[PDB]
Symmetry: C2
Subunit: 102 residues, 2 copies
């Protein structure tokens, strides 16, 4: 075409290459949400739900099992040790009540 | 105009636009980096703070304060479910302790 078209169109390819890299970056940024939902589920949700279910089983009268994940180094481990304290208190109380029967 | 080369006149004419593109890309990278500290703050307020409060309450109950108020029972997420489980556990232990106290009289 004319000089203005020859010069201006010569940068179109480069601009598309810049856009391709920006599209890859935007797609990678978007992925963070679903990956963070998965990490939260495995790291936090499942252990919290497991601990709540264990607390319910203990409150219902099942004292045979030590509370799982007491050795975990984060706040979930601190919580699991606290629930273990309740389980041990309930176990002592139940054993003393059994010694009082008949 | 002191410019001696058309290649320099044309190529320099887009420098301002290119620097703007780069500055916006630097601002995007800086905004992305801010996500980490924000996510540590969200996790602390949403999860850490109530979990530690629940663990402290569980300890107080195990130590003998059977009347300790279990916080966050009205919460709509899994922390609320956990809090309600600790409340049922407090009720069960309270009954167990009172039953023993009465049996030994
Ligand atoms: Mg018997």
């Amino acid at each position: 075409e004319n000089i203005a078209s020859e010069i201006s169109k010569s940068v179109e390819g480069a601009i598309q290459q810049v856009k391709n890299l920006l599209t890859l970056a935007a797609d990678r940024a978007e992925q963070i949400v679903n990956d963070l939902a998965s990490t939260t589920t495995s790291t936090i949700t499942r252990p919290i739900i497991e601990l709540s279910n264990t607390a319910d089983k203990i409150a219902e009268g099942n004292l045979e099992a030590e509370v799982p994940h007491q050795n975990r180094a984060d706040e979930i481990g601190i919580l699991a040790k606290s629930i273990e304290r309740l389980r041990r208190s309930l176990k002592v109380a139940m054993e003393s009540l059994e010694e009082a029967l008949k």
